[PDB]
C-alpha cells in the first residue's frame, strides 16, 4: 500500500479511488476544502443506489480521511461503525467530511456527517472507531 | 420494482443482485437454508476489499432481507445500522443471515450475523432499524 503514500502527497484523487470499491459502490469524487479537514461528493440521485443505502460510502470515508491525516503504515483496523438515516436525500450532490474526536495512542474515534444544502440539517451522521498502530 | 416480487417467486438469486450495486460491491452469492431465514454468502479473501470493510455488504444484505420477506410494494426505508466487528476474517467464504426481531406495524428490527467457521463466534453482528408501510 505504499502508493498510497505516494498518491496522497501527490493529491491523486481521482485515481487513489480509482483503485478501491467506492467509485466501484458509488460516483465519489474527491478533494479537500479551506482549513477543513478532506471532504467527499457522491452525486446522490439513483447509476442507482436504491434503498438510499450509504453505510458502505460513509464507512469508507471515514477509513480513507484516517489514513489520510495519518501515517500510510497499514490500513487501520475498524473496530465498529454506526449510522442514522435523519431525512430523505435529495437530487443534489451529497457531501461528506469527517472529523477525529479523541485520539489516544491506539484508538482513533470519527465522526462523518453526510448533507446537502444545509449542514445543519444532516441527511445523516455516522460514527466510527479504528485501532491504531502508531509506532509513535 | 415490481421484478422484484417477479424476481423472487422465482427465486433467480443471481440476477436479482445483478442490477443491485452489492455485486458491484462484493461477489455476494445468495440462496436459502433449511427452514431458515435467507443467506448470503460473499468471498472474503481479498478482488479485493482492504480494510475489511463490509458495512455496505450487511446493510444491503439486511435490506434485501426484509424485502425477500415481505410484501413488495415498496423498498424499506432504512432509520439506522450499527456494526461490531469481533474478529478478523479468514481466507474463508463469508456466510450472513438475518433475522426480523421485533416486527411492529411500522417498525422492523433487523439482526444480521456474518461468520465464517463458527457462527458463535461471528466476523461481525450489525442491527438495523427499517421504517414500513406495511399495506396491513
Given at each position: 500500500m505504499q502508493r498510497f503514500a505516494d498518491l496522497r502527497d501527490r493529491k491523486a484523487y481521482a485515481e487513489i479511488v480509482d483503485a478501491l470499491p467506492?467509485?466501484?459502490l458509488?460516483?465519489?469524487?474527491?478533494?479537500?476544502?479551506?482549513?477543513?479537514?478532506?471532504?467527499f461528493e457522491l452525486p446522490f440521485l439513483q447509476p442507482a443506489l436504491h434503498?438510499?443505502?450509504?453505510?458502505?460510502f460513509?464507512?469508507?470515508?471515514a477509513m480513507i480521511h484516517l489514513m489520510w491525516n495519518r501515517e500510510s503504515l497499514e490500513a487501520p483496523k475498524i473496530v465498529d461503525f454506526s449510522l442514522d438515516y435523519?431525512?430523505?436525500?435529495?437530487?443534489?450532490?451529497?457531501?461528506?467530511?469527517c472529523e477525529i474526536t479523541?485520539?489516544?495512542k491506539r484508538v482513533a474515534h470519527?465522526?462523518?456527517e453526510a448533507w446537502q444544502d444545509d449542514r445543519s440539517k444532516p441527511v445523516a451522521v455516522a460514527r466510527a472507531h479504528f485501532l491504531l498502530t502508531?509506532?509513535?
Open positions: 467506492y467509485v466501484k458509488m460516483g465519489t469524487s474527491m478533494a479537500e476544502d479551506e482549513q477543513g479537514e478532506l471532504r434503498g438510499g443505502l450509504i453505510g458502505g460513509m464507512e469508507s470515508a435523519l431525512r430523505p436525500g435529495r437530487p443534489q450532490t451529497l457531501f461528506a467530511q479523541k485520539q489516544g470519527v465522526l462523518i502508531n509506532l509513535e
